[PDB]
């Protein structure tokens, strides 16, 4: 709904900002072990419940 405390809104904003895939140049690096973000979140799979 409309209401949320600004702090909850900021936590949700940070979670949105984190829900991004890995840049590919990260995969080109010398000792790289990461290929997928593995902490990706879909709003329908798992809840944050803020």
């Amino acid at each position: 709904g409309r209401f949320k405390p600004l702090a909850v809104k900021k936590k949700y904003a940070k979670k949105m900002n984190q829900n991004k895939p890995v840049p590919y140049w990260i995969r080109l690096r010398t000792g790289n072990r990461i290929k997928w973000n593995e902490k990706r979140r879909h709003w329908r799979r798992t809840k944050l419940n803020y």
Partner: protein, 47 residues
């Protein structure tokens, strides 16, 4: 924000509308007075 607009761009802000974006940043809609042109100020800003 009005005072900083005056100090940084030598322009008069007649109205500042603000919002906090869903990414967490605050965005400002700043209407200048009719004595100032937004396009000229944007050009000097480099916009």
């Amino acid at each position: 924000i009005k005072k900083a607009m005056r100090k940084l761009y030598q322009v008069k802000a007649v109205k500042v509308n603000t919002l906090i974006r869903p990414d967490g940043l605050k965005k400002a809609y700043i209407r200048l007075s009719a004595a100032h042109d937004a396009l000229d100020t944007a050009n000097k800003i480099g916009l």
